[PDB]
Structure 1
Amino acid sequence: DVKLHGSWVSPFNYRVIWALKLKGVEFEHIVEDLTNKSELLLKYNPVYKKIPVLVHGGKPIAESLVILEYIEETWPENPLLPTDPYERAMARFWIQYGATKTAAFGALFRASGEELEKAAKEVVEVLRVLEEQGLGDKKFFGGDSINLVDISFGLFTCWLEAIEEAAGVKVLEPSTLPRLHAWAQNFIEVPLIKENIPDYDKLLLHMKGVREKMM
């Protein structure tokens, strides 16, 4: 009844896996080879031709953020968004902030030496705004347990760690971002996340290859 066209390394696909597992929704995972996209992927997502794509009752939903809100509305038990409209607006605001700022991380795989240090400091400032104004003193973006905002920021955990190792730069460190670094550790320790993350060695190999391609 539920199919997920995805991948073993995409952080965007993992957002959907986490949301489905938090809802207890059974699904079939269909791994796509992006160098030879299936006929179903091209039919289901003609606008972007990207994964993930959720297919529910044969109807497709593309774009991880759109999929996450569809899951929250379709399986409302175990809520992943607050009930209060102002708190829901703040959650959407921070999700949107992450979506817009994800592009700033691209420079980490394009710049060298004294230019790469500049890109890293700019990414630290993006994360500092998120830490100070978004997370604050809460354990998670969702308070005492993870919500759609934590899920949307999950790419800043093992994927960002792999990016830092591939590029030879440090961004999310405890001295510079104490609360965000503690959050990243707490997020990765949540059993649902711990049991559903790519193997670090395989993820690092993938990131080194993406960096090689972008020079």
Structure 2
Amino acid sequence: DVKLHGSWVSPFNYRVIWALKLKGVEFEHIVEDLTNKSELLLKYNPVYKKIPVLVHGGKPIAESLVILEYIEETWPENPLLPTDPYERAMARFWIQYGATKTAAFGALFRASGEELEKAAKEVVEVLRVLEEQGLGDKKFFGGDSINLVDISFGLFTCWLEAIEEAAGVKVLEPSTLPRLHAWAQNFIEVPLIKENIPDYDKLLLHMKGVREKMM
């Protein structure tokens, strides 16, 4: 009834895995080979031809942020967004902030030496705004438990750690981002997240390969 056209490494696909597991939704995970995309993937997502694609009752939903809101509306129990409209707008605002800034992380796999340091410092500043104005003193972006905002920022945990190791630069450190670093540790320790993340060695190998083609 629910199928997820995914990947073993995509952070965008893992957002969907987390939301489905938080709702207790049974699903079939179909891992796509991106060098030879299936006929179902091209039919279900003709506009972008990308994963993830959620298929529910044979009907496709593409784009991880659109999928997450669909899951929240379709399975409303175990809510992943607040009820108050102003609080929901703040959650959507921070999710969109992450979506707009995820591009500035590309410079980490494009720049070198005394240019890569500047790219890392710019990314620390992006994360500091999120820490100060978004997270604040809460344990999670969702308060006492994870919500769609935590899920949307999960890529700043093991995926960012792998990018840091592949590029040879430091970004999310406790000295510079104390609350965000504590959040990243708490997020990765949530049993649902810990049991549903790529193997770090495999993820690091994937990130090293991505950095190689981006130079």
Q: For the superposition of Structure 1 and Structure 2, which TM-score range results when normalised by the shorter chain?
A: over 0.9
Q: CA deviation at 1:117?
A: 0.3
What 5-or-longer segments of structure 2 have no aligned partner? Answer: none
SS class of match (2:146): coil
Give the CA deviation at 1:72: 0.1
Matches within 5 A, 1:1-215: 1-215=1-215
**2:114 and 2:189 mapped to 1: Cα distance?**
35
RMSD: 0.2
Identity of aligned residues (%): 100
The whole-number CA distance in structure 2 between the counterparts of 1:78 and 1:3 is: 21
The answer for unaligned runs of 5 or more in structure 1 is none
Query: What is the CA–CA distance in structure 2 between the aligned matches of 1:143 and 1:23, rounded to whole Å?
Result: 18
* CA deviation map 1:144-167 (0-9, x unaligned): 000000000000000000000000
Deviation of 1:79 after TM superposition, in Å, equals 0.1
CA displacement, residues 99-131 of structure 1 (integer Å, 9 cap, x when unaligned): 000000000000000000000000000000000
Deviation, structure 1 residue 68? 0.1
What SS is found at the alignment partner of 2:29?
strand
Q: Quote the Cα distance in structure 2 between the aligned partners of 1:62 and 1:140.
A: 27
Give 1:98 shift: 0.1
> How far apart, in 1, do the equivalents of 2:174 and 2:103 lie?
23
Structure 1 residue 138, shift from structure 2 partner: 0.1
* Whole-angstrom distance in 2 between the partners of 1:133 and 1:47: 34
CA distance in 2, matches of 1:17, 1:170: 28
Runs of 4 or more consecutive aligned structure 1 residues displaced over 2 Å after TM superposition: none
- The Cα of 1:4 is off from its aligned counterpart by 0.1
Q: Deviations over 1:27-46 (max 9, x none)?
A: 00000000000000000000
- Deviation string 1:23-73 (CA, Å, 9 cap, x unpaired) is 000000000000000000000000000000000000000000000000000
- Aligned residue for 1:13, secondary structure, equals helix
Residues 72-104 of structure 1 show CA distances to partners (whole Å, capped at 9, x for unaligned) of 000000000000000000000000000000000
Task: Quote the Cα distance in structure 2 between the aligned partners of 1:34 and 1:169.
Answer: 29
State the TM-score, normalizing by the size of structure 2. 1.00
SS in 1 for 2:176: coil
- Paired residues in the alignment total 215
* TM-score, length-scaled by structure 1: 1.00
CA distance in 1, matches of 2:170, 2:150: 21
